[PDB]
Design a protein around this ligand. Structure first.
Ligand SMILES: NC[C@@H]1O[C@H](O[C@H]2[C@@H](O)[C@H](O[C@@H]3[C@@H](O)[C@H](N)C[C@H](N)[C@H]3O[C@H]3O[C@H](CN)[C@@H](OP(=O)(O)OC[C@H]4O[C@@H](n5cnc6c(N)ncnc65)[C@H](O)[C@@H]4O)[C@H](O)[C@H]3N)O[C@@H]2CO)[C@H](N)[C@@H](O)[C@@H]1O
Ligand SMILES: NC[C@@H]1O[C@H](O[C@H]2[C@@H](O)[C@H](O[C@@H]3[C@@H](O)[C@H](N)C[C@H](N)[C@H]3O[C@H]3O[C@H](CN)[C@@H](OP(=O)(O)OC[C@H]4O[C@@H](n5cnc6c(N)ncnc65)[C@H](O)[C@@H]4O)[C@H](O)[C@H]3N)O[C@@H]2CO)[C@H](N)[C@@H](O)[C@@H]1O
Ligand code: MG
Ligand code: MG
Ligand code: MG
Lengths: 253, 253
């Protein structure tokens, strides 16, 4: 296989509708809705883009997927019950700004009763408290953890991990900003470009992203300085915005 | 919080045993085993390392965690029923080389009767077919996907994502090598260093990793050329080792 080929939107939609009819052929009345990702209200695609689709099933507990290649293109189809999909659309994880923008660009191509619009409405109406909870979790589970990793590199190496770690920290910072502003980034590739455009960034984040976006990640001393500056900015920024991590317990149970 | 502080192994093990005693007081006879994993269960922990612990519970369906910081250090304790943990230890995902080293480096600190040995034996006895399937899935779900992403960047940008994408591709290549050689990498920091030391590397992989490990990721033309060369190396390497991705179906269901 030669990897993904160039295709037009029209050629991709022909493939999409073939899959739609095959889903209806195989699963019949158990299909509530079929949608294609990236096709409502937008084209941020590309000549080499793969195909992703979602299928709402009537079967309780249905949760499976088919992901395959023809050698020329790749497809992913996820099959979920309405309940499982609505639950997922309302959960705010650390990478919500990366993952849940898809729920606003699903093109319904089969829907027997407003199911995909209900998923869209559920994804759009998430409680503000959930973003506060996710931000506090991210600080502990990701950022504090990354700070230990780069401080270990400072004292014991390996500096050969520092470029990869710096990329990971910049992405976690983009999630923090996206959660704060309730922004779902358009694509994986646009995460950093859209993150640094937002107002009220933690101090040092934009400086860190300059290394990651330019690819100038070979000066380990500069990266460690920029990481520490960003970590200090996180402390001031979270304190200022009231994202207060509980530090009062040695053991929280 | 001032970020993670320096601690000695002795200081960390004192905290581990304090947490052990609190787990036994709170959850009582439902606790079957407590272990420490990561580089502390391996006695190679760094000065800034966090603490990761695992608990085996008798409680049916138990699957929860406590993850917190004191402001000075961070702990994650995972609590799983025996059935859930053994099922997880026997599943081989794309990132098995990153996640499942926990099961081969368990330092027992409490065991009511061989529970941690059962976990190790389950992780060690996984059938070769599961690694074959995981490798074929990785090629489709990760590498083929990444090829579309950098080929899109070549024709429409943004090159500002290329350093991050290249890091991701190098990590996916390391997962492929780890699955093939049944290697669980010791730490996330050592993944690329240990990956390029293995025999039977796909052509172009070592060259790509040099960019990522040195942090010289600013030459977009060189990266795109190196990514294509690695993608070709994957095709030759998988055919030679019999990791054949099925391309004979436009729709496989
Ligand atoms: N189906 C509803 C819901 O899904 C839940 O599961 C999640 C997630 O666990 C699961 O990941 C899939 C893997 O399990 C599988 N082994 C391989 C698949 N390829 C995974 O699909 C998801 O993750 C990939 C990431 N490579 C997404 O693809 P891609 O990079 O091309 O992303 C395209 C656009 O989507 C956005 N984006 C970027 N990264 C992600 C991630 N990690 N997740 C979701 N969206 C992402 C970004 O804007 C980019 O431009 C792929 O799209 C995605 N499907 O997949 C689902 C989430 O759909 C649970 N199973 C359950 O709660 C329920 O079924
Ligand atoms: N408990 C058994 C089993 O676990 C399953 O869940 C998975 C996974 O979903 C889960 O991830 C946790 C998140 O859900 C949670 N929001 C935050 C936790 N911190 C996550 O823990 C796991 O992911 C982090 C990654 N930041 C790991 O930390 P770190 O880089 O410091 O890892 C330290 C060293 O350990 C190795 N390692 C192991 N897993 C990983 C991952 N995923 N990424 C990177 N490195 C990893 C590596 O060598 C590194 O140097 C953290 O260790 C990890 N626990 O956690 C578990 C898998 O452990 C299900 N919940 C269920 O099937 C069942 O409970
Ligand atoms: Mg995709
Ligand atoms: Mg962790
Ligand atoms: Mg950790």
């Amino acid at each position: 296989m030669n990897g993904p080929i160039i295709m037009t939107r029209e050629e991709r939609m022909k493939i999409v509708h073939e899959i739609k009819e095959r889903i209806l052929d195989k699963y019949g009345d158990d299909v509530k809705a079929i949608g294609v990702y990236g096709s409502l209200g937008r084209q941020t695609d590309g000549p080499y883009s793969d195909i992703e689709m979602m299928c709402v099933m009537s079967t309780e507990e249905a949760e499976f997927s088919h992901e395959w290649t023809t050698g020329e293109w790749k497809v992913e189809v996820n099959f979920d019950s309405e309940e499982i999909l609505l639950d997922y659309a309302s959960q705010v994880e650390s990478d919500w700004p990366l993952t849940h923008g898809q729920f606003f660009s699903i093109l319904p191509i089969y829907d027997s009763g407003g199911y995909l619009e209900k998923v869209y409405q559920t994804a759009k109406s998430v409680e503000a408290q959930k973003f506060h909870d996710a931000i506090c979790a991210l600080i502990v589970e990701e950022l504090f953890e990354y700070a230990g990793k780069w401080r270990n590199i400072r004292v014991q190496g390996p500096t050969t991990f520092l470029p990869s770690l710096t990329v990971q920290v910049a992405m976690a910072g983009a999630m923090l900003i996206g959660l704060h502003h309730r922004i779902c980034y358009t694509t994986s590739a646009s995460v950093l470009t859209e993150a640094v455009k937002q107002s009220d960034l933690p101090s040092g984040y934009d400086h860190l992203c300059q290394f990651v976006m330019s690819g100038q990640l070979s000066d380990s001393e500069k990266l460690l300085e920029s990481l520490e500056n960003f970590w200090n900015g996180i402390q001031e920024w979270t304190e200022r915005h009231g994202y207060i991590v509980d530090v009062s317990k040695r053991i929280p149970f």
